[PDB]
């Protein structure tokens, strides 16, 4: 749990990526240097998710848009829940009330948090070892 992982999204097979410019998206390449993430618990159930390469934190703006953050903050904390279907979902800690999930679309493009539903494949993630 201390080792960096990859957050694979079951919607299209994309690995959650945090590009050095703040762009959050997905890719199907495991050799990509920006898919390795280091999750940490600030408190029970709440985690930070940061690129090991750039040290950027995954975050969600007030729009419900994923982006890389040079420094951690309220927009970086996500609620991590291992679902009954055995997948992981990450809900915006700050935008919990609205149920804003971290998700990805069929093409791996950032999926606006306000368009994510409990029954979507886009919000389902799987932790995987780098190799």
């Amino acid at each position: 749990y201390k080792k960096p992982k990859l957050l694979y999204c079951s919607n299209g097979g994309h690995f959650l990526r945090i590009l050095p410019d703040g762009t959050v998206d997905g890719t199907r390449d495991r050799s990509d240097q920006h898919i390795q993430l280091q999750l940490s618990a600030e408190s029970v159930g709440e985690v930070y998710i940061k690129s090991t390469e750039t040290g950027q934190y995954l975050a969600m703006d007030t729009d419900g848009l994923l982006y890389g953050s040079q420094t951690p903050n309220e927009e970086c904390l996500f609620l991590e829940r291992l679902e009954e279907n055995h997948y992981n979902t990450y809900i915006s800690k700050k935008h919990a009330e609205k149920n804003w999930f971290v998700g990805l679309k069929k093409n791996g493009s950032c999926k606006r948090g306000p368009r994510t539903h409990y029954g979507q494949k886009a919000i389902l993630f799987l932790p995987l070892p780098v190799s």
Binding site: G12, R28, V44, G45, E80, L82
Partner: protein, 191 residues
């Protein structure tokens, strides 16, 4: 009977998703929708070799109508490359899918028994307590000093600098996740 047609993909799109990562126990299905005349054949390979249903527990079905193979309850031994091969008298096309499986562990964190362990040291000695935790979901670890439950003082290793008598006492390593929490304690003796 009809105009020859080499086998071709009928839903190339769907095939873009090459890697299928699945949590252990889920049913995995692979498809290679295709067409061609005369109507082509469907075979499947696992890491290059032929894949017979006895090759794995549970076996596997192949819905020829939906150009897919269905494997119930996948487990680690099932990980590997799966290749469909479609062909007729006029051609053969193929595609390979990667399959990865991850065993999920939905239990509260687990601490290594015996850790932390009691320790006795001399005044001034520095000390370290260890704690080994295992947890599928991210664990939150806290070390607690003791001062119908006991009062504690929030503080893999707990490091005590130039220890004194006051440092003596009981210490606890607490780890918790969304399912539950767990902890082990140890006593530090000072001389």
């Amino acid at each position: 009977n009809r105009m020859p047609v080499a086998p071709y993909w009928t839903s190339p799109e769907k095939m873009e998703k090459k890697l299928h990562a699945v949590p252990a126990a889920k049913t995995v299905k692979f498809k290679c929708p295709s067409s061609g005349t005369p109507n082509p054949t469907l075979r499947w390979l696992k890491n290059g070799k032929e894949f017979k249903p006895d090759h794995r527990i549970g076996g596997y079905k192949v819905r020829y109508a939906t150009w897919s193979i269905i494997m119930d309850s996948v487990v680690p031994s099932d990980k590997g490359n799966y290749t469909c091969i479609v062909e007729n008298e006029y051609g053969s096309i193929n595609h390979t899918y990667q399959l990865d499986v991850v065993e999920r562990s939905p239990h509260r964190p687990i601490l290594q028994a015996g850790l932390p362990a009691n320790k006795t040291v001399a005044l001034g000695s520095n000390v370290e307590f260890m704690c080994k935790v295992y947890s599928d979901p991210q664990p939150h670890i806290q070390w607690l000093k003791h001062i119908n439950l006991p009062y504690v003082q929030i503080l893999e290793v707990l490091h005590l600098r130039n220890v004194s008598f006051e440092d003596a006492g009981e210490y606890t390593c607490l780890a918790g996740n969304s399912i539950g929490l767990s902890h082990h304690s140890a006593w530090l003796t000072v001389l």
